[PDB]
Symmetry: C2
């Protein structure tokens, strides 16, 4: 049977393939040849190509959740500026890291025919708003939260331009009237 | 090739692409759906890549005329209406059943190997910021302009949630 190191290696090899060529271009046999595994090892682990791709999407989502969770958790308690700057930089870094769009966006585009994929990606975007709101919903009203999170999601649109800067976002934050009544 | 048949072929393809994506839909399918002869189509569009670039150019031109005409409808002084229209245009693009991204986003993602497509979509996106700014530059500062336009592009990201509402945007102005 198959070690878990090798199973996870097939998943992470494919993810690297998909990130740079997209899902359509890449077959099972291409994945098998890139990952240097026996064809029979793939099918011991994965019953179908679409089952595999759902497993890849789920590991990409977990990795983004863990990256962002950790970044926001490194900030000091109630250092809301540092949390907001971390959230901004996390999006800029994801967008600047051969980027033609995120892997999750590619999956939603490519798999209109598998409605669980769009729901998984919606669930992650809902999670990403909410962890931000958890750190900041007492310092930032709902309207500004919605604007800021959607402005960060616009940074992830491929070929996005005229990007908001950190200084732009810090102004949105600091202008808030409750910041000026003490 | 009739100019009329030209609009018919390119718009038949765009609607299939909008429904099923670029690589899913073949020339043969477009050619049968459009009811045009193989040999004529290849005289007008020698490759798929050639056809895709013409489709993308038309969609970009249509979007520019769609937004330009919508904004051109507001009164010269009417900054709220300009801003509401820019918001509504983005919602109107993305708030349809089965939405999984705009055609421009799909083209940039599907054709990473054709740098001409990313650059035409980028140029459209600079155009969109700049026409909005030209309306509102004396009224809203650069920081709020960049944030609002980025927020509207986030409405266009597929599977996006917790979208800003008109009243959110109106509160920011």
């Amino acid at each position: 049977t198959l070690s878990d190191e090798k199973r996870n290696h097939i998943l992470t090899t494919a993810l690297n393939l998909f990130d740079q060529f997209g899902f359509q271009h890449i077959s099972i046999m291409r994945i098998i040849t890139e990952a240097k595994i026996a064809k029979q090892s793939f099918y011991m682990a994965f019953p179908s190509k679409d089952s595999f791709i759902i497993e890849c999407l789920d590991m990409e989502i977990n990795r983004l959740k863990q990256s962002l969770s950790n970044l926001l958790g490194q900030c000091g308690k109630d250092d809301h500026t540092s949390i907001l700057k971390s959230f901004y930089q996390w999006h800029v870094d994801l967008a600047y890291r051969g980027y033609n769009g995120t892997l999750l966006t590619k999956a939603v585009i490519e798999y209109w025919n598998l409605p669980d994929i769009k729901m998984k990606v919606e669930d992650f975007n809902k999670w990403k708003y909410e962890i931000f709101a958890e750190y900041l919903a007492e310092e930032i009203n709902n309207a500004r939260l919605r604007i800021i999170v959607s402005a960060m999601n616009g940074i992830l649109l491929p070929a996005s331009t005229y990007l908001p800067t950190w200084e732009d976002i810090e102004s949105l934050y600091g202008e808030q009237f409750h910041h000026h009544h003490h």
